[model samples]
Target: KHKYHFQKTFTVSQAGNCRIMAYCDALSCLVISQPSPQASFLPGFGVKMLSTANMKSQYIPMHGKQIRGLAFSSYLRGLLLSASLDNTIKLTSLETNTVVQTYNAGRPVWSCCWCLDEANYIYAGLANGSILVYDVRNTSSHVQELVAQKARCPLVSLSYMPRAASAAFPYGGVLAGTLEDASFWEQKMDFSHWPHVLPLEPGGCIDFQTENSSRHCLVTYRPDKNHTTIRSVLMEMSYRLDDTGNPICSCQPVHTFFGGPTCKLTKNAIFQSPENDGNILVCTGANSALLWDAASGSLLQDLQTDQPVLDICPFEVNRNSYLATLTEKMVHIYKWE
Candidate 1:
């Protein structure tokens, strides 16, 4: 075990199978979303918001199908965005305490994100292997569709910028992925043409964790088409100019670590607290969460759980920027002491 420890701060329960948890630093709160369970109403589900200070929660009934993505904006503090398999995106006003706008995606939305530079700009990764950009200020249709894949597979995730990726996407762009590939798009680049796609093996779900305000992303998948071992890798984005003088970006492994065994469910990964100097990484396992020491490529410890934890959210909150891990109906909150 490492010198640090996660004190289970508190626990919150959910009503359905929650697959997403996110921390909005600008809002100083945590939110989790769940798909409606088979036993309950089919066409309804909710997003639960927790105030970190008091542990108080407000439930906002939000989607009709499984909600796959949740995002918040540092610039637009009160706005919340949720992408759903219901084929729609809902924009909620946390200030007014209601969903203010809805944008219909022609296909199911797998993930959605907000751009830091253009606060009004949003991106939705759809089931049909396309990234749709929306100007939520006035339109219901996507302003631009970045068709990263010409053959079209299910799109899994999107990141406006991973922690240190701004060095590559200085003007702001998007990072998107599927089970078989990952790609990058520069902000001003022509969206009509295809993007630079990185090869990844298929047959498993891919999770993209882009916290740390950050550079790089951690994506989970089988190491190759021939193996059963599931691993999460620290991948960074960087671009070198091609001979024609255009930026060609590459997403390559950082190699300090390859995470623990995980399930096929797009598992989430996060950086260890700043105290570790980014040397530690954490990821979801079968029914537990494992921590790793990146410098030595060693296993640190395991945080046990009763169910397959589908997602984890790490946020800063003084004693605990802490963490929230989502299972079927329970959310376990953790803080390093």
Candidate 2:
């Protein structure tokens, strides 16, 4: 494997608590969230878009509080989705640099994602462990609200499975990670499906990847039960119908490993390859970035930093892939040059 070298720090007007980031490969732009200084604890400068081409940056104060997640739409160019601690999920346009829509959750939105098939469908993971589904055409009110985690378990992350994520969910699915468990709701055919929950595990969610025909999801969890050691598991989906014709689903672990010590901090990881064949994974740990061999379950590199990295993003440019890591300070780019 080739080695990745440190590129350059992303330009910013001022140092910030830059905790979240999303890169749009279609337009070759990066959207990042940074909390300004002298503001209250969660007060952020909203988000800014920087072109990876010229490194030019444009700012937009899009949210009221800290942004927890950002997802750029592939279905609609220039549209970005954000989940914030301010109890809302907002849609903003990068072209006009304006707020497009705001779906008030009344609860801190920990995570959010867009459906793969259309931009109209949006999903948000709430601080109350609920999942709200919205359709842009109708607006304001959510069309469907699922009590994904009824036990007051805050859902920290979410993902939209492709149409074939499992046979039980032919139309795709919504995968969510709660404080102590991972669960997914089948998109359904005639739609006769129930919430499928994984085994009782104290873990959070990270990455989900689908191969040529199979699907695999990677998650983070505490192994020691002491919270001193945390690791990730790459799990594949397996499902079948019962004798009563009731659909059943489950997760099978393919890899349970650690690249570096990830305890005492957040559990955020990103799949580093998009060619769909590379066995590389990148995870945040102890303010550093850990590189892992997904197939072998081995640590390849541990790139240390000064502050804790809150998020990681992988993007491709000029047919080469790069990674961006976010700290409270700024965004750092890594290049496999």
Candidate 3:
């Protein structure tokens, strides 16, 4: 197979920590989180928009503490949501360039995500080990409070499963991974208020999404490193709802591999191809990324860079597919073959 080539690189000029990057298809722009310079140790953070064409950026201050996570809504044109270390979750509108809504999570929010089927609901994974589901219509209180794990194990990652839905849950299901033990948990959005914890190896980094049919979910597990190379796994989960509207999920191992033995330890991120084929991307910091054939667990391509890769997002524009990879200081755009 041929190597993956870079198309262009966009520099993020701001200083301090840059936590996450998200691509907006409707606007054809990148939304990034950069914690403010003087308050870098605190919750002072801002959101910036970078144009895909010119690479110019506009910054808007978001929180009093460092921002931990960001997710943009696909159903809503310009609505962006953020999770912060200030113990808050907020929604911002790009069109109006305003912070539209803010909720006090009462705990540092480590991760946040939008529901797949609707814009009215948003979920936040908290440092207090709870998953709070908020109805955007009512900003006064959260609609559902789910205890996903114990307080000591902060929920480090969260995503909505694209398939895994039923008559009881129209928005599908939600998956969360914790930081301490590196465990993963699933909770159906239906009336049943129980969370099903999966038995998988402990890994703090997670990426989860479903294929077009929604019958199966692609899950990637990355170990919380120990200043050295670590093993990572990819799994395909097939699930169905019971007669009583409960979910029964089974996992099939797709790939199990290790990182470079000499590379220094850093965080990892994962993504599935936008086309929903069994292709997966795993980014291990220390200048390495891998594209894998999910069905065969074989490497299809390897992308090497000069900096630590922080995040990877795959998007489609005008029927063409593109990938955006974010390092500590820049965003690199690539074409996926």
- On lDDT, the candidate that comes out on top is 2
| Whole-model lDDT values for every prediction | 0.69, 0.70, 0.66
Tens digits of per-residue lDDT, candidate 3, 148-223, equal 5543556767766653344422334576766543333454445333565555544444545444342334444555
Worst 10 residues of 3 by lDDT: 163-172
Residues 1-337, candidate 2: write the lDDT tens digits. 6656788886553666676778888889988887543443344557778787775576678777778778887778978999988988898888778888998899889888887753467888888788888887877698788786546667777777667544534546777777766777777654322588866466443333333234666666664254545666777777778899866777788777664544334435646455457555645455577777667777777777787766767777777777777776677888866
Winner on TM-score (2 vs 3): 2
Q: RMSD (Cα, Å) of candidate 1?
A: 3.4
**How do all models score by TM-score?**
0.85, 0.86, 0.81
Better of 1 and 2 by TM-score: 2
Hey, what RMSD does candidate 2 come out at?
Answer: 3.5
Off by over 4 Å in 3: 1-3, 37-43, 53-56, 164-171, 181-193, 203-229, 239-245, 260-285
lDDT-superior candidate, 1 or 3 = 1
In model 1, pairs of residues that clash are 162-214, 162-215, 163-214, 163-215, 164-214, 164-215, 165-215, 315-321, 316-321, 317-321
